[PDB]
């Protein structure tokens, strides 16, 4: 199995535009959204077909109730933060919790919060403590660290529960999550050489340029891995051509255990 991850996000907005929801929560398996909830629908719904097909309506009813409670908690927490920052206007509160199951069988787990899109509190499940970025966060840290049982509950959820959910979701969607679509790679001139790959899954891919057998990372322009819209991805990397001397440039692409080399004539 490749490396896989499960994570849940929460977003809260204090003074939202009339149409915008006050609260949003979305879950992901690695790059696929699996679940969604917001303060407008008031319902937790699947966002992947293999989620809806393997979880009975009983499951969505229970978690709809949980998310409704978590929505009110998030609003209370954001109200406290913005009052203690002495901030007026609209401000955002975010949360991310999740876990990774690595290829070698090891696991990781993480939990952190953000205010206005910047790190606010970061959980360390090994030392069972919260890292605070400022004194507003420091006040929250002291209150949360006084509740030792909740810290232990979060450690157990990250290390045991999250990993079990991930393995369960990986089986539900194995046709999507565990498939491999190799990239189609080509080279063209636009002076710089452009190495372009498309049609691949999973999105994880490594593209680089080698000059006479050596890799100069500073000279290479790396493009983003972008969704094509059909479930596959595309990416590119470019390097500038020396007009005064000929060199042997070769593109190297690594994807899902297969290595590719395109030597430029």
């Amino acid at each position, epitope marked *: 199995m490749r490396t896989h991850s499960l994570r849940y996000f929460r977003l809260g907005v204090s003074d939202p535009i009339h149409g915008v929801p006050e609260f949003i929560s979305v879950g992901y398996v690695d790059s696929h959204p699996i679940t969604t909830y917001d303060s407008v629908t008031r319902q937790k719904e699947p966002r992947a077909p293999w989620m809806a097909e393997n979880l009975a309506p009983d*499951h969505w*009813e*229970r*978690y709809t*109730q*949980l998310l*409704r*409670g*978590w929505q*009110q*908690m998030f609003k209370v927490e954001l109200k406290r933060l913005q009052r203690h920052y002495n901030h007026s206007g609209s401000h955002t509160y975010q949360r991310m919790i999740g876990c990774e199951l690595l290829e070698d069988g090891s696991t990781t787990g993480f939990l952190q919060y953000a205010y206005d899109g910047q790190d606010f509190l970061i959980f360390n499940k090994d030392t069972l403590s919260w890292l605070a970025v400022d004194n507003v966060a420091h006040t929250i840290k002291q209150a949360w660290e006084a*509740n030792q*049982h*909740e810290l*232990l*509950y*979060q*450690k*157990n*959820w990250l290390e*045991e*529960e999250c990993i*079990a*959910w991930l393995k369960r979701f990986l089986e539900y969607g194995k046709d999507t999550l565990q498939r491999t679509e190799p990239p189609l790679v080509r080279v063209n001139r636009k002076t710089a050489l452009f190495c372009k790959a498309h049609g691949f899954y999973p999105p994880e891919i490594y593209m680089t340029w080698m000059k006479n057998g050596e890799e100069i990372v500073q000279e290479i322009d790396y493009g983003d891995i972008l969704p094509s819209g059909d479930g596959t991805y595309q990416a590119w990397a470019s390097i500038e051509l020396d007009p005064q001397s000929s060199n042997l440039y070769s593109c190297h692409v690594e994807h899902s255990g297969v290595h590719m080399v395109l030597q430029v004539p």
Partner: antibody
Amino acid sequence: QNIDQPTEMTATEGAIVQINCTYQTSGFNGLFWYQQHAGEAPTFLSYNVLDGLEEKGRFSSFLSRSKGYSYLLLKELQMKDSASYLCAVKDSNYQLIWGAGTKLIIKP
Amino acid sequence: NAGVTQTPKFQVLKTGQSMTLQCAQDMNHNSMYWYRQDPGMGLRLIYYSASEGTTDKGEVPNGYNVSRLNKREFSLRLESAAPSQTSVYFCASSVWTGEGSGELFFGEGSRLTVLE
């Protein structure tokens, strides 16, 4: 999903008693012990979610997640410890599954 | 600081009679629950309210209805009392529902006997 604890236990004043609770649940988010005197409200005693032993006065609670089992240990028993002891487990959906409770009888 | 207060403590009912159990908490909690306790089995949830403005069925909702009137109050209703509803009813509350390690705070209990 089910929780299992003995129906009744009898021990003598001043001795030590261990009340067992085994669970088979869909996921695990913590195990609770509550004390309920006859005709009165249950009150919270302890919470365990990681493995090991936690002490609170004369009462200590142990948990092994791998064996799916916990015990509540009462030392230096007194007559006021006569009560029912309820164990409850939170499953993967944060629902409490309650054991039937153990009635502890203390011989003076 | 009364904690959880439920009434009545005792009530005898004839089959088909209506009955409302009251419960209030003054701990500024958000989650409130109604349990029934019967000999030989663990507590069974009837209805619960994870927060003010939302309720949901528990394990044994049939024959009962609840109304989360506000943050403080959570009433249990038996419209047509049945002999199987002879039980001791416990209302409880917790700070939050999604709080992992949060414990329950129970009321004193209401003993109901329903007779033909």
